[PDB]
Design a protein around this ligand. Sequence first.
Ligand SMILES: O=c1cc(-c2ccc(O)cc2)oc2cc(O)cc(O)c12
Length: 318
Amino acid sequence: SGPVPSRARVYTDVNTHRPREYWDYESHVVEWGNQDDYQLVRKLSEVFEAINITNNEKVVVKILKPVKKKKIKREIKILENLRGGPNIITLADIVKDTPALVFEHVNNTDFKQLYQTLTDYDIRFYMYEILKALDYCHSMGIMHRDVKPHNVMIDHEHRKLRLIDWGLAEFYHPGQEYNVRVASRYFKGPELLVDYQMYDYSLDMWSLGCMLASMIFRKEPFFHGHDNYDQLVRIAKVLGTEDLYDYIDKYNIELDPRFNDILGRHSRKRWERFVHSENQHLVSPEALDFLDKLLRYDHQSRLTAREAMEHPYFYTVV
Ligand SMILES: O=c1cc(-c2ccc(O)cc2)oc2cc(O)cc(O)c12
């Protein structure tokens, strides 16, 4: 038989109706800069602290390992297209002499020490700033596909945020089937876990939901499995089994020989039950209702990044 196809609810054709020079990265002319403009100072995966000689400016250089030329091109073209977007890491330069990407400098506040200083107001503020980056990149036809805390740099001392590591990002094309290896296991949407390849921007919205959940409930990560099979089980224990099968049925997905039994039966849990005495100060009914609308099995019924910015949760921050 086979599975039912899917198209993105919003921003379906932004790449389709744009010139080939925008999305067609494999045949892109990369204008290489000079590595001798920059002086490597310290290693921060080959990421280096550096100084631009031509102006004494602090930068961060990423030296690219032996990967396929088309993967280097994909990341370069995406960063170039998104340069100037709110809270997207700025590509200052691309250099040779062996390829390197040069980024604006950013401090990273030590997590844990970030995780202990953060108030309810800080989370709303930083979630809003990530959402401006996601709405912007989605509107530009780009999925990030790796939204997670290690790719969200928060410079708390300066109240600053950058969405980084666009190495796994892709341009959205309706009907296209994509790799399901992408993203950290813990932030993989149900679509990636059931091997449904025709996904879209909505994946990043699931990942963002897992981010909020673990931040407000203070448990990293929120859904914790050892494989893709167990991961779906951990999500099922919270969202319930009924809404999951309603999703399988809707898209005619056929489960792996292992999914059937490990699922069992689970009711939908109210989010309030996860509030305990150490995380109480970060949670509100607004926060819980926003989380509920992001973390839905159905990728077509998840809040878009724009819809999300209109939730009462962010009212105090807008
Ligand atoms: O660890 C870092 C990684 C990156 C980075 C940024 C963009 C990419 O596509 C890949 C990696 O930028 C940074 C920028 C900084 O200012 C500081 C960092 O530690 C990093």
